[PDB]
Each structure stands twice: as structure tokens, then as C-alpha cells.
Amino acid sequence: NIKIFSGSSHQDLSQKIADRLGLELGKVVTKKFSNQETCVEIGESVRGEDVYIVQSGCGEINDNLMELLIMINACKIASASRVTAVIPCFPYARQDKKDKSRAPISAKLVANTLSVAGADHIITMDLHASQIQGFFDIPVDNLYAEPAVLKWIRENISEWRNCTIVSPDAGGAKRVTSIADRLNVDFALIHKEDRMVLVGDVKDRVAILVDDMADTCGTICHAADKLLSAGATRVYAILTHGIFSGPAISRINNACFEAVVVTNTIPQEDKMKHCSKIQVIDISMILAEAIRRTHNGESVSYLFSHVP
Amino acid sequence: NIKIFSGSSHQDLSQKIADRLGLELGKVVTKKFSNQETCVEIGESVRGEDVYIVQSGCGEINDNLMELLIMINACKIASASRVTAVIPCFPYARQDKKDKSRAPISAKLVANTLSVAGADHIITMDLHASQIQGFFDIPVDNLYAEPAVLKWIRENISEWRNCTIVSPDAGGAKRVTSIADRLNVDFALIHKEDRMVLVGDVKDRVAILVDDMADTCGTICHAADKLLSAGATRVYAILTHGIFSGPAISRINNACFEAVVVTNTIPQEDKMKHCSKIQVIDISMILAEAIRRTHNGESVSYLF
Amino acid sequence: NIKIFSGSSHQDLSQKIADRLGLELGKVVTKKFSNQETCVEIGESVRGEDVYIVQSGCGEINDNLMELLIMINACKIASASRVTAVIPCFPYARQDKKDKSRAPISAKLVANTLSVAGADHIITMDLHASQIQGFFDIPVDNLYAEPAVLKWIRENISEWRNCTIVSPDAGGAKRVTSIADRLNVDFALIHKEDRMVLVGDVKDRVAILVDDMADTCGTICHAADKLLSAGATRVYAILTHGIFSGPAISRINNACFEAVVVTNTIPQEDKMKHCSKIQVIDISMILAEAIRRTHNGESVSYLFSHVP
Amino acid sequence: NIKIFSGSSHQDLSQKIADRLGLELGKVVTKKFSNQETCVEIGESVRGEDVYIVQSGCGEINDNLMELLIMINACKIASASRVTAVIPCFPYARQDKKDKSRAPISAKLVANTLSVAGADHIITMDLHASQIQGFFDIPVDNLYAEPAVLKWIRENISEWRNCTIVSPDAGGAKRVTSIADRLNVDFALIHKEDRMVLVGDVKDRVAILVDDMADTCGTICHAADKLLSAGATRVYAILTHGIFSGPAISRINNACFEAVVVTNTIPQEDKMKHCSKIQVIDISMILAEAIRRTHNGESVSYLF
Amino acid sequence: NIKIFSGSSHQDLSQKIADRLGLELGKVVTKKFSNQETCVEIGESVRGEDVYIVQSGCGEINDNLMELLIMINACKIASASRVTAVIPCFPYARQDKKDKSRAPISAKLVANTLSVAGADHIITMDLHASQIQGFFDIPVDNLYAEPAVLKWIRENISEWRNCTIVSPDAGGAKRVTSIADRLNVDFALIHKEDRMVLVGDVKDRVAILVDDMADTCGTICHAADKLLSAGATRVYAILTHGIFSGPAISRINNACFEAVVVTNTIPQEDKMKHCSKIQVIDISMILAEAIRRTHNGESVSYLFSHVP
Amino acid sequence: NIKIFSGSSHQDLSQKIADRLGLELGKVVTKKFSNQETCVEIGESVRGEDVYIVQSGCGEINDNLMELLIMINACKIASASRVTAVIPCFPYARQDKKDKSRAPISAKLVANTLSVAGADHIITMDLHASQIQGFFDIPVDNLYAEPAVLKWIRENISEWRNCTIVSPDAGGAKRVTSIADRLNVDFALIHKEDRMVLVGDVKDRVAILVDDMADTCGTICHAADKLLSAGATRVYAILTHGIFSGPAISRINNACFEAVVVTNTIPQEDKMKHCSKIQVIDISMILAEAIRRTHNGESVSYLF
């Protein structure tokens, strides 16, 4: 009844998930035309099946999105019983409001495209904004890396009991206070004005910058300096989504981080070869278990505070 | 061509809006059956007209929402050219995410009810969260009290140039850092572990608590005490949406606030007689201008 | 697979139904904010389940409706397999047409709100107008109190074989002729012009006023007088939905009714303490059985002429 | 700017409407393939125009409905600004509820087909049931023959001031009590147990049978006999929608009716030559005025 | 779980399909009013069932379509689990584009009516244009008579290995080249300008005109003459949908066809009595098997190249 | 009132269109994040305006489609009166059917994305298949290069009166027979069994290969060889949509084409310097006229 498919050929995460569920990834004949159009053919019947499409870790966001939409459509019109999009890193998630400008809410457009392509269910991890669940009328399960983060901290940072959890911006406050409260430690916040201001005590403590994602790493790198100047003993960065585009890998190599921790929601293997500071938390088990629970009608909510 | 209607009994804001636009409120017979059902009867033709329904402030959120939905529907099925809901304080705005709970996203439900009722356009002020705009497929104009708040701060707080804008909670961080930046002053934040924790400096300076809304005022009143303990000269409370229900009005007086500043997005006339430190910023001009500009194809962004 | 939830704390009907199905009502953390906003939290997983939400008997129609919509939404986005609204008394049912005025069809708006909240199915009893089923695109089962009414009449009115079934208005004709034909008796009709006119013979017969609902009871009370003046031996009123708001309980106490019979679609316990003329027909079994049949894929139509 | 098109072959009503509005009917090539498929080809641009399609009276209900849906779609995809279906007699109106059966609500299906075809507005007359308006989310204007029926009664029945308005069935109760009230006369009702039963007084007075529609006229003809047996002076039959199919025309002559009055919502010209007691009320002026008023943002309620 | 219903009283195909599945057709009380309105009543419960409605072979396209829509609606609001329209010959399929005129895309309107009536799935055979599948958002299975055609040819035309497959028009090229390639033979094409032009060699070969449908047969009859004049040994016509309206049966009787082969997607029994040249390929097994596979979640795609 | 915006970087067509209409392109800041996400910011009010977005030609089909969808959405939620997508070459047009495969109908998906993004109207040229219009419920105007192709044939091929219009494949049959009919010349068709097969006569006459589009040009180049082998005097290739990616430009030169004629629905300026036999037909005037006529309620059919 269960059927798992991958996007593109960045199948590492997809294969890890399929492995954990005891399944082979479904056959897809999936190539890009000479004119950059993606052609897809589902190589097996999906009729009456519970289909899960895991979005590729390829960097080109528009290619990845279109491929996903196309595969959703193909499965729907081939009479799949249900089609679930498994989207570890939600595309255009940072474009979720107008911010006083004549801007698109591109995340709402993305949710609309997934809905009209025929998605019945979304599984995602750490949406940049939780309100994005409201952009759909279909159910969304928004998984958290938090339990895996708390675990990583307790086992890797000796001074975790006396550390400060630090938000790199104003929008991350609720997220760091939540980790701070669970660990029973302090929190601090950095706000960029072309200067950063820090509120909260980090003096003579380990500082852990926690964000949902880092892209060019300009922010986390400057925040690390700022934290050291404020007297933090050393600085960690823990992000769920490691985009690391453009100059990021250069910035990290030169930055005063003790370690930069990311999940494998985005493929990190190439980036790790050029950046020794990077460590990866595997989230394939969380994703596999959410898929398993979804299919069985069991509680996905268990995964919100517990690591499977 | 333009027609403005009001919700149930709270006419003050609606009448202020209509006055500024040179218009009388549209005729509507609005009431309640002995069995609590809302009756509404548009008392004039709205065929081919640009209709604006300004949501009532009877305080009872479900009655007010149902009355608005019913008026939208009646206008739509009476062949209005367009219907805009003008909703200064968006119902259920706080319920805009699951929060790790098996909870409704009631703000999205409310957006869907408005859309299915036939609204073509929404005008609102200081949405608890900006993503609520994305809960609709119809255009939403989200007005800001911010410019009127900053004006009031400068014109009423002598020591404003060196004060600190303070958030009652972790979630209000963005709102206070925006205000503090435009003033070029400092910010601080309070978090409830319970015990309250303060990050940032307020010592020997005026503290201004800024929130989008206050309900029971439990948080804002406890916040004010912590601020005083940390050596704030005087403490102010600025709220765009002043609901002030329950113990709120008494809690305010029993608190140290030099003043509690709210907008008239919700009626305050009753709560001002019972609380002397409350001051009101009139936003009827911001809303009238939004309607006029919406009607005329003119830029509403200017009001931001 | 089956899960029953109640609205508010007027859980009598809900508990009766749950009892009959051998179930406990599902856990809900359901409170009203200081600012009259209803906050709801489903206390157990509904993932993959057949959910039934029974609307509260609390009098405040807008609070009750909103609570119901909110619970439907919560269950839908929590991945319930199906969500059925069980709405014994359909709100705003009397606002189902324009009546030559610039009026809302509020019942159509209500049906639209239930549909967008995510209802897949409605179970209701004696819709004021059967056309209201057409206000939905989802299936509606409209149950009838008629079989329970016919039963009540045969067992409580000795002269049932020679009685007259009387409509209190023009809109109730089809409903009374139907009861009249089944009992093989006469029917009559009252029409209010500020005076009532009666067509049909009631002289020296027991008269039974049958309506779908009574609210302030102005109409049924005046109809009872009118029937006695026409020479009816005595008068009964049988309504399915007993709203009894405002002066109703005063009007009934002073009216010349032998008995006023209602169902428990709306809670009557408080109203009975102040009004001895009221008797209640329990419809929990009809509702429980429709829920049971719905869930099993069995015939709900059996209940249209038969009392379970 | 306004453009009026007609259905297949029944042009009389459509042409009457267009004449009153000072307009020629729009060019359309409408036919049927040898294999019964409806072909339609709008013969002029309707881009940016206010288009009114008046439904045809070829009698064949499914052909007429499909032709209307196709014309609506063609106008919509040719970028008409707005499309109104003008449907004097709403197809499948009688099928508006399940009636305790595993039955379709075909009137709702018809409403959905119209909506999906692209209709923005409906104009109709004497909907079998008023709730049918709620089967749509688009505006519906439901016109009344009532004022024209009352005029005709007074102007044609000498003894009208003391007559009785009678319903052929239990379901027509509201329709007859409304007419009887405005005239300040009595009403009565017939119900089929079969044997027919009469409630109300008709003795030594003129009886007027009033229904929204009559098909085979079995009910209305049997009703007329019962009324005569109960001592009605003379019996009239008033029907807004006169379908008169099958044995109806013969059954009418073979019956006692002093007259059978219908509107021209359905063509009657053929059925008037075969039945002399039939009289027609022209409703083209009511419909033209509704279109003109719909077009101009003027009050259609006035016509009620 | 499976339930099959027919439209009207042209139940031959429907009965054949029901037979092959081991089922009796469901009870329907289905009559036309004196005013040409179709009244329908489903005589048994369809609650929770997998419903298949097979569209009648009656000639009156609008009556047939409306009846089908009405039955779909009736089953949907009676809480069928799924409703599938089985439409062997898709109505208004030839009206699937604007053709430079101010024309309706009537096939898109038809697909929209089926969707709003509540169809969850369509089963059809040889859509005039495959793009018509794109007119729906629900899944469409478009079955092919091709495997049954190839079989008929191999067993009935001795010279099949040296024949020419001929398109009667420009729009049929892809269809004939496909049959030609599978049989490993030649293809040709006729194009009407008031004259026909033929491209491709048919000299001294058997010619097989293959089209999706024939209506008045003006085209195929003229094409047959043209093919004989070009030196074809003899001419066959194989259509999937035999409408044969108006003068068709007269035209065929006088035309130089060796045989005219059609499927029973449309009833042919009456037409065969007046036209001896007509032979019928039974497609009830293909339809029955697609229904069986649909219901079971098995591969319908097997039927695209294989005859069951 | 009318406002014209362009996609990312391909401005040439958009600027040609705006020039012909007497308009400057609307201000928009359009770019790409380091992480490939499309950023778009409408730089002026479009409230109450008739907005036309002309799709960009950066070649990367998914980037171009996403940028278009985002611009449509931004214009819609900024209260544009109407949004038209002007898409000379419809993305994924070739994927308009399953073709017996478990395949997407990606053209329908694309139509749905455009519709959900908020497009009210589409203008496009030479849809690969005419049924693609039915993939929408909004109006689509499908313009033709045909009249401009026929003009070019007569004005550039001396021996056109006795030439043969040839299809590269079985599917292009209708397109070539239409062209051949209007010219009153012959047609032929090529099919790939592989070995290529030719039906129809091309001996000692000029052969014109006509397709709606060519990508790698593998088919069209192999077609040209077969035509020469069959004794065609000279061979031309006419394509409304010239994608010309990969080996195409080299394959063309290495082929026998006297000329390869395309429209500028896709930029060609780079591919003309690298290939001398390419000629371009400007279609900016056809598209400008369609926008102007769409805006003014005038007949676009005239351009067909």
C-alpha cells in the first residue's frame, strides 16, 4: 500500500528513508529535455497506493519544485489513493509575508501550486514560520529538529548546563527561549540595525546560535564575532536547514565557530569536504517514522519531543 | 457609488469613518432573535455599488463575526459590485498556528469564512501576524498604527530620546525592535520561564511596553512590575488593540503605568471612565483614507 | 476507527449517544478566552479516524456554531479520515430564502462555513426546509422525528384514531398531511393574516398541532385557543425542536395545551423544571444508530419510517 | 454594451424582450447534428460586453439546458464581461429535495452546471421553491408573476371580491394564502389521500385554482371536479408556468374551467389554437425591465 | 463493495459488463416526465460502496448526458464511497477546441459538468483527442480498442501483412502510423480540401481505413472510392465508435467496403439488421476488466496492448 | 490604466511590445538569491490597473515559469483589476497528454498553476495543441504565426506556387495541410518507423519543413536529408517556436537548409550570429495588438 519516490538524482535522503522503512524507492524515468523541461514517467503502477514523494536535495529550487509538482500530478492522475509531499526544506518559506512592500507571498503561491497539483498531505520539517501550515487547506505535519538538537547539545557540549542559547535575529526569539527553557539555561538575542546589538548575558558561557536555516552565513558569522566580543567562551551554530550558498563555506572556514551543526534536510556531503567545521545530524529516521505513522494512522506528535 | 455599512451596535468608529468620507451609513435593520440568531436586512439597494462593511464592536467575538459574514453574504447576493470587510481587529488572529498542539488554526478558518461569505477585499490593522495575509487568496491591506504610535511617543514622553521599547513576551521581538530602530533607542524583552526574565537595559530610563494587543493584561501588568524592579524611571504601555476584558481595567489602575495608550479599533469610551491613565489614538482617519484610496485606485501603501 | 466529540459542556445528548455506541466521548480542552474567543485542543490523536462532532445544546447560537467549525477544522488538519457534523438542530435554518426582501440566505452561509471548515458529511434532524440539503455539495442525512412522533401519539393519546393533525402555519401543510395519512385521520391548517384562520374540521376531536420547531410559542399558543374555539376537545403540541426562548415558558404555562411534546435535540431539563406541561421524546438512539450506520456503510434510510 | 441572445428555436419571448430594450438579438448559428449534438457558434464579438442569454422553449428540457450551458461557456471563453442566464422556467425546479427517497436534488445539479458553465447572474420567474436561490453562490433575481395575476383576477372575474383561491395540493399552501391575503378573500386546499379531500369553504363562490406550474394537468383537472362537487359557482385555473404536455390540452377542454390563465414563460401559441379557454399573460416586459435594471445598477426589487 | 448501474433502457452493454463481473445491475427507478425531465431513484443503498455508472447507448445525447449526471449526483449525495462514470463514447468529444472560431469547447464543459455532479473517476474508450484527459482534474482511464482492432485484422484479413492502414483525415495520422508500425505495414493519409487528396501507396494492397468514429459516413465512403481509384485491392473501415446517424446506413450499403467494423461502445443491433456489411467487436470484456482492476487497485495499463 | 511588465532578463520582446503601445515597461526589481530563489518586487502601484505580464526568455523554463507565477501573484494581491499572462511559447505545451504512459499532463498542471496564481486571461501564440485552451476555465487567446509565415513564403521563395509543405512527423499533419491549402500547393509527411518514411510528392520542387517548434533539431535535420534524397530542389525549415538548444545550431549549419525561419517568441539574437541561415519574423506587433485589443474590448479574432 506504501510507495516512496524520490526527486531527481540527489536520492541520498530518499534512499535513507526508504531503507529505514524496508522499501526500495519506486521506479521513475526522470530526465530534463534539451530545453530544460522536466519529463517524468512513473515506472510502476501507483493505483490505489499510499504514495510519498520526497523532494530532491538538488540546489536549483525552481527545477526541484517543478519536478515535485509534476510527480504529484502524475501520481494523482494515475489513481494513487493518497499522495503526500515530503518536503524537508519548504521552498520560498522565507517569502511568507509582504513586509510593508508590494511583494508576493511566494510561500502561499508554493502551497497553492502543491494543492492544485493534487497533494493530499504535506510532511515538512521546521517551517521558517509555523503560520505556513495555514497556507494550506490540506493537513500539514511540521516536524521539529528540536529533539535531535537538544540531544546533540547534551552529548557534544560539556558545558551545556551553563550555556546561552542565542537567536541571531528578532524573529528567532520564541525558538531559542523554547530550547533555553527545556535545557534550563539562559537565552540571548542579536538584532541587526549596519550594526548588531546583543541583549542577554553570554559572558564566560558557551554560546549556541540556533536558527532554522543559514544561507550565505553573513549573519551567523557576524553574530559569532559579536558573541566572542561580549565574552562568550566559544560559539556554536546549529541550524536545521544548511543551504550554504555563495560565500558561506568561505565565511564558515574563517569564522570563529567551534562547530556548525546542520541536519541532512539538504545534502551536505560536498559541503563537508570543503568545510571541516560542519557536522550533520541525520533526520532520515524522523522522516521515515512520520511516513510510517502517517500511513498506519499512528501519532506523529510523539516525534515533536522524542527522538525515534 | 461607494456605500459604507456598520456592524451591530458599535457605530462610533463606523460613523467617524462615514463622516470623514462625506457619507451617511447605509440603512440596515440589524438585531438578535430571542433565541440569539442574528437578523440582518439591508435597507437599500446595493446593486452595482462598492460596499464597505466595518466590523462592529459589541465585544462578543462570535456574534460580531457572524453578523459580518451575514452582511457580506446579503450584499453579495443583492449584486453589490464589490464587498470589502473592514476589520480593525481581526477575529481569532492569535490562533494562527498549531503551536505543537492538536489545535485549530482558527485564523485560517476565519479567513475561509470571510472568503466563502463573498468578501473581495479585506482592510485590517496590525495583524497579530503578517502571514495572516496569506490565509486569503483575496487582497488584504494591513494598515499600521506604528506611525501614529511614534508620533504619540515623541509628543508625550519628554525623555523619549533615551528610553527603551520593551516587549512583554518573546513573540513581540520584531514589533519592538522596529519601533526602537525608528526612534534610535534601545530595546529589551521579557520572557516568562513562573518567574519573569528581562534581557536588555532599562536602568534609569523610561520604559515603554509595546504589544499589538492586551486582553486580561496579566502579562503586561506583571511586565510593568519587573521593569520597575529593574530601575525603569517610569513605565508606559502601548497597545494597538485594547480588548481590556475581565480584571484588566482594575489590574491597570493597580499597576504603575504612567499611561496606557490604545487605538479605537475597539470601543474604549466605557473603559476610559473607569480608568484615567488610558489614552486613545483615533485611527478613523487612517481607515477612511484606506477606503477612499481602495475605492479610487489610489496608493494605500502611503499610509504605511 | 470511530471517535465522538461534544461541543461545550451541554454534553447530555452527546453522552447519551456515546453511551449507546459503547464509547467514551473524546478528550477536548475547550475554553472561552477573556475576550469571548473559543480556544480548542483535541486531547487525543484523530489520525485516520472516523470523527463525529455533536454540536452543543448551549443556547448561544453563534458561540455554538463557531466552536463546531473550530473543532471540525482542528480534526481535519489533524488528519482525521472523515469528519461528520452531527447537528440535531440546524442553525439559521429558518433563514433559508429571501422572502421578497434584501435578506441573506443565512442557512446557505452556514452550510458554506461547514463545508470550508472541512465537514465531509452532515447528520441532522428535521431540517426546517428539506431544500437545505441542496445547500451542500457533501452528503446530508436528514433524520425524521416522525416515526418517534407517530409512536408517541399512538401510545399517549387514546383518541388518536379520530384526531386531527393541525399545521400552525401555511408552510407546515405537507408535514401534517403526511402524519394524517399515516395515522389515517384528518388534518387542518391555521394561517395567520393580525388574525388566524382555520381550514379543516376539528370539532369534537382531539387536535394535535405538529410543527418542526417552536421558539417564543406565540403561534402555537394562539393556535391552541383558535382550535378550542373551533370545538376541539383538547389540544396537543408536538415539536421536534424546542427552542422555548424568551416568554415561551410563560406562554405555555398559561396556554390551554394538554401537553407540549418536544425531542431532546435541544436540552430541555431546565425548561421542564419551570414547565410541567412539557414532555420529552429521547432521540439519542436515532442519532446513535445513524452514526453507527454511517460508519458501517449500512442503511440510514431504515430510520425514516422505523424507530430503532 | 448590452447583448441579448436567444436559445434554439423559441424566439418569440426573446424577440419581445429585445424589442422592448431597443435591441436586435445577437447573431448566433445554433443547430443540431444528425447525431443529436448541439452546435453553437456566436456570430459576433462579445468581448467586454454585458451578455444576457434567454433560454429557449423547444420544450425538450435536456436539449434546452445543454444549449444554454454551451452558449454561456462560449460567451465566457470569448471574454464577455458578464453572462446572465435569463431562465423564465428553471429546469428541474421540482427536483429540489430528496423527499425521503434515494433521489437526486437535480435542481442543485442544474445550479452547479450553470455556475461551472460560467454564469455570473441568474434571472428567473416564480421558482417552484424560494430556497433554489440558495443552490447558487451567484446572485439570483427571482421575479414574480403575482402582481400580474392579481391584476388579471380583478379585471376578469366579476365576483372576485368574494371568491376563494384554492391550492391543488398541500405544497401550494403558501402561494395561495399570499394571493388570498392581498385580495382579502378566502383560501382552500386540496389533498390527495386515491380520494381528494378539500379543506376550506368554496360553496356558492368562484373558485380559482392557483399553481406555479401544471404538467399533465391530471391534478388540476381532478381538483376542478372536486371544487364543482363542493358547490363552487365557476372554477378558474391560474398557472405561471404552463407546460401542458401529453393529455393536458384535452383534459383542460374536457374540464369545467371557465378559463386557464398562464404566462408566456413557455410558448403557448400552438396550445391556444387547440384550447380556447387558455389566456396568456405577457411577461416580456417584466423580464426586459429586469435585464435593463440589472444592466444599469437599478432596483429590480421594484418589479416584485 | 462494487455496484454497477445502467443508464436508461439501452442496457445491453451494461448487462454484458455486469455479467462478466458476476453481478446484477443495481435497481434504478428511472422514468422521463411528461415534460421531458428525467426522474431517477436509486432502488438500493449505495452507502460506502464503489459505484460504477455505465452511460446509456440511447441516441439522444443530451438526455443521456443529463441522466448520467443525475445518477452520479444521486449516488454521491447517498454517500457512495466512490462514483466512477463509465462512458464508452465521450459526448461532445469532437468539440474539444475553438478551431479559430468563437466556439465553445463543449467537451470541457461536459468534463466540468461530470466533475461538479461528483464523478471521482472516469473510464472511457478512445477519446477523440487524448488531451481531453486534461479537461479533468480527476483521474481518467482512456482505454484503447487498438489491441482488439489488431486482433480483428490478423484473424479476418488474409493479406494483413501487405496492407496499408489509411487515415481518412489529417487528424488521424498518429493513430494509423501506430497501427501500421505494430503490424509492420504501410500507412497512407487522405485529406479533404471539395476534393480528397491521398498521400501514400495503396496500389494493389488491401486498404484499411481506421478512424476513432464515423457519424454520417460521408468521409469514409468517399475515402473508400478514392482508395479503390488509387488501385487498392479492397477497402475495410474499422471505427471504434459507430454513431451511424442520418444517411450513414444508406451510404454504407452503397459503398464499396468489403466490411465496416465497429465496437459495441454504441448499440449496433438495430443498425446491423439494415446493414449486412457491419461487423461488431465486443468490448464489454475490456470495460469489465478495467472496472475490476479499478476496484481492486490492479493495473489497467495491461489493457492498452493486451486483449483480456 | 494599462500596465505592461516583463520577465527576468529577456526584455527585447517586452520592450518592443511596450514601444508599440506607447508605454514604458513597469518598474520591477527582479533577481535571484545565491540559493536560486526568485525575488520579485513590483516597483509601483498596480491598484485598479489592467496588468499584462510578458513572459521572459532566460531559456530556463522552470525559472521563467516560477518568476511569471510570482509576478502574477504579486499583482493580484496588490489589487490589480485584471492580470493577463502573455506567453508567446506556452511552457510544457508538448506534455498535453499521457501517451499511453504513466505520465503527467504537465501542460494542465501549468494551466492550473497560472490559474491559482491569479491570472484572469492568457495570451499565447501557436499552442502545440489547440485543446490546451480547454486546460483553463479563464479565457485564452491563441494567436497564429500562420498569416506571417504565408507572407514570408510568398515574398522569399520564388518557386512557392509549386512547392510542397512537409511535416517532420505524423502529428504535424493538420498544421501543414492548412498551410498547403491556403497556398494551393501539395503536402507531404515524414514518419520515423530507425528509418524515415516519406508519404507524398516532393520530386523536383522546393520543400518547406513546417513545425510549431524545434528543440535539438534532430528530427528536422534528419527530415531535411530524406527530403533531399527524394529529389527536393531546395529545403526550407519554418518554425514558430525556435528553441534551438544543444547541438541544434551546429546541426542546422551542417544541414542543407536554404533558410531556417523562426519567430521572436524566443530570443534569437545570440543564435543568429552563430547561424547565418536563420531568419526572424517579428511578432511583437501581433502581440501588442492583442494586448491593446484585449484592453479596449476590440476584436482579437481579426489578427487570426
Numbering used by the authors:
A (entry chain B), C (entry chain B), E (entry chain B): 3 to 195, 203 to 317
B (entry chain A), D (entry chain A), F (entry chain A): 3 to 195, 203 to 313
Paper text:
PRPP is formed from ATP and D-ribose-5-phosphate (R5P) by the phosphoribosyl pyrophosphate synthetases (PRSs). The human PRS family, which has 3 isoforms (hPRS1, hPRS2 and hPRS3), belongs to the class I PRSs that requires divalent metal ions such as Mg2+ as the activator, inorganic phosphate ion for activity, and ATP or dATP as the diphosphoryl donor. Due to the important role of PRPP in the nucleotide metabolic process, the stability of PRPP content is essential for cell physiology and is predominantly controlled by hPRS1, the ubiquitously expressed human PRPP synthetase. Mutations in hPRS1 affect vital cell functions and are related to many diseases and disorders.
We determined the crystal structures of the E43T, D65N, A87T, M115T and Q133P mutations at a resolution of 3.0 Å, 2.14 Å, 3.3 Å, 2.11 Å and 2.74 Å, respectively, with 2 molecules in each asymmetric unit. Overall, the structures of all the five structures are highly similar to that of the wild type PRS1 with RMSD listed in S2 Table. In the A87T and M115T structures, the mutations of hydrophobic residues decrease the hydrophobic character of both Ala87 and Met115. In the PRS1 structure, Ala87 is located in the hydrophobic core of the N-terminal domain, whereas Met115 is located at the hydrophobic A-B dimer interface. Consequently, the M115T mutation might affect the A-B dimerization interface, whereas the A87T mutation might slightly affect the secondary structural elements of the N terminal domain. Nearly 13% of the mutations affect dimer interfaces directly, such as N114S and M115T. The N114S mutant decreases the hydrogen bond interaction whereas the M115T mutant reduces the residue’s hydrophobic interactions around the interface. These 2 mutations do not affect the protein structure, but may slightly decrease the protein’s aggregation states, thereby affects the protein’s regulation or catalytic efficiency.
